[PDB]
């Protein structure tokens, strides 16, 4: 089955940097587009970053609130996803989930979510 | 940006009843709306893909419907394990956005 | 509509790509080679042209040391009169269509080299197996 | 290190140019009409859904249309299944009788001509002894005089006795998806600016072509494959006078061909089970069949093609048109099919202009001929049967086939003239995107690994 | 333990239902007769000895003969090689002449009727100038009157001129072993109790069927495949009125069909190398052709089938019979072949009884027709040539094709009626034991082993 | 004595039998698959259908790790979402036709799994062979 | 040691005798002439250069040429493509009209006879109403008298209406290279002393035979495969009287056949597009067509073959010749083709000698026949059209087909007699060197190695 | 010079030579086995007869232990009732055409011996593979 296990969460001062990791198994890693989505303490879900798969074009996508600030990358040979954070803000405080999408035309949805790693910025 | 509005925010129903959760998009997303269940102390879990498409491993009591901007997640006999936080998601345009969630309580 | 669905690299995907990325998926060009009263003989004479030229490369593969392994090392060295190219380029600079032009004179020397380099190795397995 | 070793690679993307027999893929939706109401609807293959049009990134490819194959095979087999759709029908040999023809009963004006002759003759019945005396109607383009009185004979009665056409079959074009066999790909040039030859830097691989409609027009290509942005012209040597200029324009031109005679049919019995369909009375008036184009559209399209012709012949070039100086009746005219009957129009109100670098409709007077010698074979013709009622069709003019006038002086004018010639060039307006390659895997490359013992 | 792994298994017994083209296996003993004295004796495959009929223990299988294929393919190719055996024979076009027919010279009783008319006509010889005046004899079911005097013409002269039959070929049935190709098995239901549908719990796989005789009878199936123990009836919905009830009984009923006219032949020359065989004089007396069945056997067999019919329609059911209320001459009659000549009998002394749940022979007056439009195609017939001498044959009635009477009331009687209809329903009495499956090996199953590296 | 006609069955002999006795003799259904002017083209179109559907199975066999061994382990685990059955039953309780109904949804997932499980091990074999 | 184990060996040279379908290899130089000006030049395969004639040292092989196959298949398909080159041509049915014939205008000597009759008749034109009255010229071997007056008819008008021959095709022999398919070899016996049967201790393997020209001569084999050193004679049982003696001699004998009539053609129109070529006027004189051989060469060659005949019949054997006592016109004569016309000569000035053990030319008076029934089929003939001008050809007599005279007494003489008979024996003069084997690899041998686990 | 046509024979070159010299070049008879509207059906029925009689031996070869190895040991002993010949002769005294006559009675016992001697080694490999 699909397993996504995130690590790297911590307490960060604002303006600081932090790299999250997501170790994936159970699927052909490079073919799928992968994303980071965070869940705020009020339980709201805010998409954070996406990196497309090898056959999807491999581009990165970010919402406007983080564009120019957040960088998502992947190392497909070890099946690991990264989320590189810089110029961190207190609003970034959330549980961050790694998520895997589906396949083909009906696969831009999040299909699998990881357990999450907690980031607290204060 | 597409704004997703989930309704209701919270709803108490007795186990065994059926519910219809609404998610409304600020623009048409043809059918690009997905539903997730997050139980308490747990991660979210995909329930329904592209308005209506069922997911292997998810119980048949989860059903989806809706087209355009208005989408609905039906849970047709709610079980104790189904109570939790419910999310919709759109893939029509960047940025990807979520609804605020429906809290299903016992 | 954002296009995030996984879309596996289709047929002929790395056909302009380098050899180090074309050799990642070789099975996709392999598997679409057999499957995919007068206009029935145009079906017949397309089918019976397909199975001989499938069997002919499966025989030239068969009569070397590579039965169905689809990737295999051999023992003949690479004479630089054939290609004269650097090694560090020819896995990430050129491409395969550029290779077939770059080597097509020197083919049928390699194909002649492979049967004797296999049957010599073949009889050497026989000479090893005969004594015990 | 330097001890590089041969390593073979099976299943590797490379291809070479080749030519093999392709096959149909008729659309499965056209399978509902039962048992060949048109030719080749049961004979060849039901299609596939969603043909895998897949891009080939970072690929440029040298296409070609003049030394191309597979437009010769499609003309070959379309000839062959035309003979397949003519071998069941009844041969019309015993109609070669010395006719006796008068004018049809009509208000004969000297400006109009009797287009239809009466031609009452003798013809055998189903009994071998009796011979009925039957009459018909015939066009003036099908009888010649054996030379008081006025007695004709059929024109094809010399040298080519030819069949009737079974009214079960239909001459409509259906789409045809040509598909490659296993081991062959079909490259499609996706370039929106692509003439005949030249490297096409945006290709895509399919397995089945889009639905091609086989139509038969000599001049004025119809009903197929409009251009993307501009009016694209493409030829061989544009400084040649023997190579046609296949114009393909971007917006369609609507044609409105009709035939306002009622044209009641009747069945004469030749013998045992041999019917012959002859036109009996015509109800109403004998009026001329015509076609219409919008003058604003046609003049706008010539405004397009006079820009694109100056793109190849420079500016200050006085472009004028003319009307196909000579040739047969089937090359000087816009010869086509409409609902099962064969109109021969007169493109001489169209191709008559002159252009210097500084609401109404055009009516084309057509005329109908019943025996047919399409593709100009030696010992064939084709008696098309009459059809009931008023006949009317609507088609899209998509491309022209012009031809320059072979000057040898330092002039500016270029009096273009339309001309059909070979019928293959029609299908060259449909088969310029597609070439067929042969996948030849099992390449070979040296690397640093050795087969261990 | 639980780390189960995929292991494929090549060559594994499972099958799915399919349908592909089967072929002959003619018996090798019928190969001594040279070059198609009967149809399909050199054309298709010489058989094998001892076909491996091997049991499949602990196997039940849902057979079917009503939605079955391969009884459609056998009808398809038997049509096709029937048309293959008529293309060499001589076309009979120049016989469509206006006849002049009187009564034949005979002791004309009013009860009997003149079956053969004289019909002296004119017909061209091999020279194109001369026309001989020849006479013949013809049945009354082959001439119609063109309307003092009395002059006829042929009935098929309207709409269908049709061929002679070459006297080399013969219309007798030979056994035919249908065989599956490689990769396909033929399941044979060995159950002695098997109606139409239902799982057959005792199957066996062959590769070639037993010798099937292709006969053409409409009612009263002949000469093939008797039942095992009882009289088996089988249909589609027995509460349907459009589905025939193929009765197949266990012991054969001997028929004694004959033709007591001598019927001397003669050869008229149509043209170059085109002979035509017409019946000349008849030597002796003109007597009617009949068939015989034993009255004790037929009444005993109807005593059997009214018992098996009460198994489906209950007891106290007054079963009665009737005589196929209407239809054409080829459906109201027992139409069959005997030695090369075509008897049309009259089963109305047979199907006339009534049955309540509590030495002599029957003679059936048959009649002969020479042109033949078997399978009722549109533009074909078949002039069977005459044959010499007194004609007599003996055959086994094996099965009937009955048809119920579509009542809509709460009655007890069930007036069963015979009816031939489609000729395929004969072969569903022969191809109900056999279904054709496709062996699909290379299955896959998880077990606890992993491919070590 | 030695040799009786009871347990020595024929073609498709154990076709209703359990898997533990059907996998004893699989070669007998394997080897009887190829050998045994218009009525000749039904022979032609029966032959080129037999050799095509034989080659299709020899191609699906060829592109995995199983050249002609006819029974072979692999490396992919058996997810219980496929079958969820006990092991101790499915080699002597059920039968093969019951298996083909019991699994027919889950084919083309296994067939997609087998190609990647061969080609990943293949290139990892090449990366193992390249360093030495 | 003694634990020997089975080891199979794939790809191993052994063969068995077999027979499968062989194919053409037409020479590529004969491909320039477009679309079958001779039969089988576009239909079958263009050849290869330098066929791999490779020796097989230390190989002996039991050849045979009398029980050989593949000379039956070549006769079969040459029959078939002879009918293939006659299916497009026009059937000549409407020529069966009652002729009216007089003598041709000529210097009638009592010794000579009128070979050509006038035969003016009536024949329909292309119009069905009119009938032209045309005249021709005809040989005496094509008309028979219908019985004051004198009226003939065609000889083949009884029982066989047969086609004309299209002047596009040509009856010249082209070389044909037979090639084996993959898996079959062609053994060639390279022995310069090799009769019919017997082991040939010097073989060689080819893939394509040399170019065989299929000619049709009954006696005096022509234009092919001269012997090596001597004059080789070869037969079946030489003490049999029913087995022909295929003499094949070493040096060619030049024949000089001609026809000195001018023989102007003309085209009569039968109907629509059906021309008929009839001989019009003859320009010059009416002289008989003849052939020449050198008398010193022919007498020297019979001096050779009576020496080789004494090798089988001993010395002091008075060998004499005779002139084929009886038979039809095509077995008693040297029947052959020359440029498209069919000469029947009279070898009775040739085969007339006697031989005991101790500059001028021979003229053979030939005669021409226009309908042709080559291979003596039942329902065919062949109207060869006339040809313009004086006709002359030069050919090499290469081999004879003799036949002994079946004595049953204790005589010494052996009156040999010529006789053509079956045309296969001509091709047995070309295919006696060649046999076709089937390569059967996968041998097996025990050695001391075991498949390790 | 260098390069001569004497010892470099051709197709069926050593067909009279001894077995110890015929087994030197077996590939030359192997590789010339596949490559090299009514006169097309003699091409069709020659092609589907060539590929049929090639596939029958490649299938009988495939189901033994010898996929395409062209020389392979096996496990069955050589019963002297088959050949009874000396070893020192039968690789250099007799010839192959003499061998096919010398064994042809005893074939279909060897061909019958090979499937069980392969399938026994196959299932014993499976019983070895099942425990791990
Ligand atoms: C066949 O007859 C037709 C007449 O029905 C010929 O046609 C014309 O013949 C005259 C003869 O003087 C010519 O002047 C015309 O040029 C011909 N016109 C056409 C369209 O052919 C015809 O020439 C005859 N021959 C053939 C081979 O068709
Ligand atoms: C062809 O002619 C035949 C006889 O001339 C027709 O047969 C019968 O025609 C009469 C006309 O009064 C009808 O009453 C009968 O019903 C006809 N019988 C049959 C069996 O057809 C026949 O109708 C004509 N037409 C065809 C198409 O055969």
CB distance C122 to H71 below 8 Å = yes
Task: Indicate which of E12, E441, E447, E449 best probes the interface with H, i.e. most H CBs within 10 Å of its own CB.
Answer: E449
Q: Cα–Cα distance between D245 and D234 in angstroms, integer?
A: 6
- CA of F112: which chain A residue's CA is closest? A28
Q: Cα–Cα distance between D186 and D23 in angstroms, integer?
A: 13
Experimental technique used? cryo-EM
C-alpha C87 chain-centroid distance = 19
Tokens at E250, concatenated: 């266990």
Tokens at C129, concatenated: 């197996």
> How long is chain D?
453
> What's the start-to-end Cα distance of chain D, in Å?
19
- CA of B28: which chain C residue's CA is closest? C1
Q: Cα–Cα distance between G333 and G315 in angstroms, integer?
A: 31
Tokens at D344, concatenated: 């021969």
Residue range(s) defining the domain that contains residue G415? 215-430
Tokens at E302, concatenated: 């109807």
CB distance D196 to D235 below 8 Å = yes
Closest CA to D404 of D393, D413, D396, D395: D413
CB of C44 less than 8 A from some CB of F: yes
Contacting subunits of F (3+ beta carbon pairs below 8 A): A, C, D, E, H
Domain match, D225 and D322 both: yes
CB distance G396 to G249 below 8 Å = no
Cβ atoms within 10 Å, residue G249:
21
Q: Cα–Cα distance between D231 and D305 in angstroms, integer?
A: 7
Tokens at E255, concatenated: 């028929």
Question: What is the 3 state secondary structure string of D69-113?
Answer: CCCHHHHHHHHHHHHHCCCCCCECHHHCCCCCCCECCCCCCCCCC
C-alpha count within 13 angstroms, C-beta hemisphere, residue D104: 20
Pairing outcome for strands B102-105 and B10-12: parallel
Question: Ligand 2 center to residue E376 CA distance, Å?
Answer: 15
**Residue H19, C-beta contacts closer than 8 angstroms, at least 6 positions apart:** G445, H90, H91, H92, H94, H95, H96, H99
- Using CA atoms, how far residue C43 sits from D276, E329, G276, in Å, is 37, 44, 41
> What's the start-to-end Cα distance of chain C, in Å?
68
- Using CA atoms, how far residue C74 sits from C87, D452, D453, F132, in Å, is 17, 8, 10, 13
Q: Cα–Cα distance between H34 and C54 in angstroms, integer?
A: 11
The residue whose CA is least distant from atom 2 of ligand 1 is: D158
Pairing outcome for strands E5-9 and D61-62: unpaired
- Using CA atoms, how far residue D111 sits from B60, C59, D107, D115, D137, in Å, is 82, 78, 11, 12, 21
Q: Which helix (H) or strand (E) covers residue E437, if one does? A: strand E434-439
Domain-embedded: residue E453: no
Is the bond leading into E360 cis (omega within 30 degrees of zero)? no
Tokens at E244, concatenated: 């025939």
- Give the number of domains in chain A: 1
- Using CA atoms, how far residue D244 sits from D292, D419, F119, in Å, is 25, 8, 53
Question: Ligand 2 center to residue D269 CA distance, Å?
Answer: 15
The residue whose CA is least distant from atom 5 of ligand 1 is: D155
E327: left (phi over 0), alpha (psi -120 to 50) or beta: left
* A106 chain-C contacts, CB cut-off 8 A: 5
**Strand, helix or coil for residue D426:** helix
**Residue D406, C-beta contacts closer than 8 angstroms, at least 6 positions apart:** D241, D242
Interface residues of G toward D, Cβ cutoff 8 Å, are 126-130, 271-273
Q: Cα–Cα distance between A96 and A101 in angstroms, integer?
A: 16
Domain match, E32 and E111 both: no
Domain match, E147 and E196 both: no
Cβ atoms within 10 Å, residue A14:
13
Q: Cα–Cα distance between D203 and D433 in angstroms, integer?
A: 9
Domain match, E419 and E386 both: yes
Q: Which helix (H) or strand (E) covers residue D394, if one does? A: none
Domain match, D77 and D111 both: no
Chains D and A touch (3+ CB pairs under 8 A): no
Closest CA to G381 of G103, G112, G164, G107: G164
Tokens at D7, concatenated: 């390593």
The secondary structure of E301-320 as a DSSP string is: HHHHHHHHHHHHH-SS--EE
Tokens at A81, concatenated: 């996803």
Tokens at E172, concatenated: 């007798």
**Residue G303, C-beta contacts closer than 8 angstroms, at least 6 positions apart:** G355
Closest CA to G298 of G396, G389, G192, G215: G396
Question: Ligand 2 center to residue D425 CA distance, Å?
Answer: 52
Tokens at D275, concatenated: 């019917």
Tokens at G431, concatenated: 């295919």
Domain match, E198 and E132 both: no
Q: Chain D: nearest CA to E159, how far in angstroms?
A: 4
Residue range(s) defining the domain that contains residue B31? 4-106
Question: Ligand 1 center to residue D142 CA distance, Å?
Answer: 12
Q: Which of G94, G158, G379 sits opposite E126 (nearest CB)?
A: G158
The secondary structure of F61-116 as a DSSP string is: HHTTT-SS-SEE-BS-B--TTT----TTTTTTTS-HHHHHHHHTTTTTTHHHHHHH
**Residue B33, C-beta contacts closer than 8 angstroms, at least 6 positions apart:** B4, B23, B25, B50, B51, B64, B66, B71, B88, B89, B90
Q: Cα–Cα distance between C32 and C29 in angstroms, integer?
A: 6
CB distance H36 to G182 below 8 Å = yes
Which mutation among E143, E147, E158 tests ligand 2's pocket best, with the greatest number of atoms within 8 A of CB?
E158
- Give the number of domains in chain D: 3
Q: Cα–Cα distance between G124 and G134 in angstroms, integer?
A: 10
Closest CA to G285 of G260, G265, G266, G316: G260
Cβ atoms within 10 Å, residue G8:
24
Q: Chain H: nearest CA to C4, how far in angstroms?
A: 42
Domain-embedded: residue D274: no
Question: Ligand 2 center to residue E156 CA distance, Å?
Answer: 9
Task: Indicate which of B90, B91, B92 best probes the interface with C, i.e. most C CBs within 10 Å of its own CB.
Answer: B91
What's the CATH number where B42 sits? 2.60.40.10
E-strand stretches of D89-244: 116-117, 120-124, 131-135, 138-139, 143-145, 152-154, 184-189, 199-200, 203-206, 221-222, 232-234
Torsion of CA D102, D103, D105, D108, to 10 degrees: -160
H59 and F25 within 8 Å at the Cβ level: the answer is: no
Tokens at D276, concatenated: 């012959």
Give this entry's resolution in angstroms.
4.5
Domain-embedded: residue D270: no
D69-72 long-range contacts (CB < 8 A, ≥24 apart) are D69/D19, D69/D436, D70/D19, D70/D22, D70/D178, D70/D431, D70/D434, D70/D436, D71/D424, D71/D427, D71/D428, D71/D431, D72/D424
Q: Cα–Cα distance between E276 and E164 in angstroms, integer?
A: 8
Q: Cα–Cα distance between D155 and G421 in angstroms, integer?
A: 51
Could you tell me which residues are beta bridge partners of residue G144? G153
E159 lines ligand 2 (CB under 6 A): yes
* E39 chain-F contacts, CB cut-off 8 A: none
Q: Is the dihedral of CA G368, G372, G378, G379 positive or negative?
A: negative
CB distance H28 to G11 below 8 Å = yes
- Phi, then psi, of D300 in degrees rounded to 5: -70, -35
The structure tokens 């050989």 sit at G68
G126 and D160 within 8 Å at the Cβ level: the answer is: no
Q: Chain D: nearest CA to C39, how far in angstroms?
A: 6
E102 lines ligand 2 (CB under 6 A): no
Closest CA to H78 of H121, H113, H120: H113
Ligand 1 pocket list (CB less than 6 A): D 144, 155, 158-159
- Using CA atoms, how far residue A85 sits from A8, A12, A21, A92, in Å, is 11, 11, 11, 10
**Residue G168, C-beta contacts closer than 8 angstroms, at least 6 positions apart:** G36, G37
> How long is chain B?
106
Nearest ligand, measured from the Cα of D269: 2
CB of C7 less than 8 A from some CB of A: yes
What's the CATH number where G426 sits? 2.170.40.20
Domain match, E109 and E145 both: yes
**Strand, helix or coil for residue C95:** coil
Q: CB-based burial of residue D237 (10 Å sphere; 0-12 exposed, 13-18 middle, 19+ buried)?
A: exposed
The residue whose CA is least distant from atom 27 of ligand 1 is: D159
The secondary structure of chain A as a DSSP string is: --EEEEE--EEE-TT--EEEEEEEESS-GGGS-EEEEEE-TT--EEEEEEE--TTTT--EE--TTTTTTEEEEEEGGGTEEEEEE-S--GGG-EEEEEEEE-BSTT--SEEEE---EEEEE-
- CA of G451: which chain C residue's CA is closest? C129
- Phi, then psi, of F126 in degrees rounded to 5: -75, -40
E158 lines ligand 2 (CB under 6 A): yes
- Phi, then psi, of D301 in degrees rounded to 5: -75, -35
Domain match, D231 and D201 both: no
Closest CA to A21 of A103, A93, A90, A78: A78
Question: Ligand 1 center to residue D386 CA distance, Å?
Answer: 25
Question: Ligand 1 center to residue D274 CA distance, Å?
Answer: 29
**Residue G124, C-beta contacts closer than 8 angstroms, at least 6 positions apart:** G94, G130, G131, G132, G270, G271
Strand arrangement of the beta sheet that strand E184-189 belongs to? E15-17, E434-439, E184-189, E203-206, E54-56
Q: Which helix (H) or strand (E) covers residue E297, if one does? A: helix E295-313
CB distance E248 to E232 below 8 Å = yes
Q: Cα–Cα distance between E245 and E235 in angstroms, integer?
A: 5
- CA of F125: which chain D residue's CA is closest? D449
CB distance E137 to E280 below 8 Å = yes
What's the CATH number where A8 sits? 2.60.40.10
Domain match, E12 and E51 both: yes
- Using CA atoms, how far residue E10 sits from C85, E441, F62, F101, in Å, is 45, 6, 12, 17
Q: Cα–Cα distance between G187 and G195 in angstroms, integer?
A: 16
CB distance G134 to G268 below 8 Å = yes
Q: CB-based burial of residue G262 (10 Å sphere; 0-12 exposed, 13-18 middle, 19+ buried)?
A: middle
Q: Is the dihedral of CA E187, E190, E191, E196 positive or negative?
A: positive
- Give the number of domains in chain B: 1
Domain match, D150 and D208 both: no
Chains E, G: CB contacts within 8 A come to 31
C123 and H71 within 8 Å at the Cβ level: the answer is: yes
DSSP assigned state of F31? H
Q: Cα–Cα distance between D160 and D372 in angstroms, integer?
A: 11
Q: Cα–Cα distance between F29 and A48 in angstroms, integer?
A: 58
Domain match, E107 and E250 both: no
C-alpha D384 chain-centroid distance = 17
Q: Cα–Cα distance between G20 and D385 in angstroms, integer?
A: 51
Closest CA to E442 of E55, E183, E62: E183
Domain match, E290 and E374 both: yes
The residue whose CA is least distant from atom 24 of ligand 2 is: E158
């Amino acid at each position: 089955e699909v397993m996504l296990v995130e690590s790297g969460g911590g307490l960060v001062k604002p303006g600081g940097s932090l790299k999250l990791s997501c170790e994936a198994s159970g699927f052909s890693f490079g073919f799928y587009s992968l994303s980071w989505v965070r869940q705020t303490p009020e339980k709201r879900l805010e998409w954070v970053a996406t990196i497309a798969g090898s056959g999807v074009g491999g581009q990165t996508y970010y919402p406007d609130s983080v564009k120019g600030r957040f960088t998502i990358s992947r190392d497909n040979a070890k099946n690991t996803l990264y989320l590189q954070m810089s110029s961190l803000r207190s609003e970034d405080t959330a549980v961050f989930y790694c998520a895997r999408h589906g396949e083909g035309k009906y696969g831009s949805n999040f299909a699998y979510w990881g357990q999450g790693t907690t980031l607290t910025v204060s | 940006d597409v704004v997703l509005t989930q309704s209701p925010a919270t709803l108490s129903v007795t186990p065994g009843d059926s519910v219809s959760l609404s998610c409304r998009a600020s623009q048409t997303i043809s059918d690009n709306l997905h539903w997730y269940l997050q139980k308490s102390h747990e991660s979210p879990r995909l329930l329904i893909k592209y308005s209506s498409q069922s997911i292997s491993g998810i119980p048949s009591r989860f059903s989806g419907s809706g087209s355009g901007t208005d989408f609905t997640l039906n849970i047709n006999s709610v079980e104790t394990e189904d109570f939790g936080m419910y999310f919709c998601q759109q893939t029509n345009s960047w940025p990807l956005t979520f609804g605020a969630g429906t809290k299903l309580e016992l | 509509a954002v296009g995030i669905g996984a879309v596996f690299l289709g047929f002929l995907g790395a056909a302009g790509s380098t050899m180090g990325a074309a050799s990642m998926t070789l099975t996709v060009q392999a598997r679409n080679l057999l499957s995919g009263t007068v206009w029935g003989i145009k079906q017949l004479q397309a089918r019976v042209l397909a199975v001989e030229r499938y069997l002919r490369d499966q025989q030239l593969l068969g009569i070397w040391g590579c039965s169905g392994k689809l990737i295999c090392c051999t023992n003949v060295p690479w004479n630089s009169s054939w290609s004269n190219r650097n090694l560090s380029e020819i896995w990430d600079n050129m491409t395969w269509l550029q290779w077939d032009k770059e080597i097509s004179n020197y083919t049928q020397i390699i194909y002649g080299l492979l049967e004797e380099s296999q049957n010599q190795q073949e009889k050497n397995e026989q000479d090893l197996l005969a004594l015990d | 290190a330097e001890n590089l070793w041969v390593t073979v690679y099976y299943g590797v993307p490379v291809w070479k140019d080749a030519e093999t027999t392709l096959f149909c893929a008729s659309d499965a939706k056209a399978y509902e009409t039962e048992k060949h109401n048109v030719w080749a609807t049961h004979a060849c293959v039901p299609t596939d859904p969603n043909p895998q049009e897949i891009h080939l990134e970072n690929v440029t490819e040298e296409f070609n249309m003049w030394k191309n194959n597979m437009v010769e095979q499609m003309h070959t087999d379309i000839i062959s299944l035309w003979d397949q759709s003519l071998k069941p029908c009844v041969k019309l040999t015993p109609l070669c009788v010395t006719l006796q023809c008068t004018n049809v009963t009509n208000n004969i004006t000297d400006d109009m001509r009797g287009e239809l002759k009466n031609c009452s003759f003798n013809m055998t019945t189903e009994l071998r002894d009796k011979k009925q005396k039957v009459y018909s109607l015939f066009y003036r383009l099908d009888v010649v005089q054996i030379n008081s009185n006025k007695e004709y004979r059929l024109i094809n009665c010399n040298t080519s006795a030819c069949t009737q056409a079974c009214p079960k079959v239909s001459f409509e074009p259906i789409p045809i998806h040509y598909c490659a066999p296993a081991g062959f790909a079909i490259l499609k040039c996706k370039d929106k600016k692509f003439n005949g030859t030249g490297p096409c830097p945006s290709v895509s691989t399919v397995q089945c072509t889009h639905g091609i409609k086989p139509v038969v027009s000599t001049q004025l290509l119809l009903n197929g494959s409009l251009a993307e942005e501009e009016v694209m012209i493409r030829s061989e040597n544009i400084t040649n006078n023997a190579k046609n200029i296949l114009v393909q324009f971007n917006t369609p031109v609507q044609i409105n061909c009709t035939r306002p005679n009622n044209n009641t049919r009747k069945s004469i019995r030749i013998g045992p089970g041999q019917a012959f369909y002859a036109t009996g009375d015509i109800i109403g008036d004998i009026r001329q069949a015509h076609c219409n184009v919008s003058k604003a559209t046609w003049n706008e399209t010539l405004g397009k093609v006079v820009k694109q012709l100056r793109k190849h012949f420079g500016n200050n070039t006085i472009i004028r048109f003319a009307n196909s100086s000579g040739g047969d009746l089937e090359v000087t005219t816009h010869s086509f099919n409409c609902g099962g009957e064969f109109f021969y129009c007169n493109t001489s109100g169209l191709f008559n202009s002159t252009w210097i670098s500084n609401n109404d409709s055009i009516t084309l007077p057509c005329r109908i001929k019943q025996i047919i010698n399409m593709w100009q074979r030696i010992g064939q013709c084709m008696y098309a049967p009459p059809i009931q009622g008023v006949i009317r069709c609507v088609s899209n003019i998509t491309g022209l086939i012009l031809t320059r006038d072979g000057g040898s002086t330092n002039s500016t004018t270029e009096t273009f003239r339309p001309g059909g010639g070979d019928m293959r060039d029609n299908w060259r307006s449909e088969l310029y995107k597609y070439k067929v390659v042969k996948i030849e895997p099992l390449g070979v490359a040296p690397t640093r690994c050795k087969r261990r013992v």
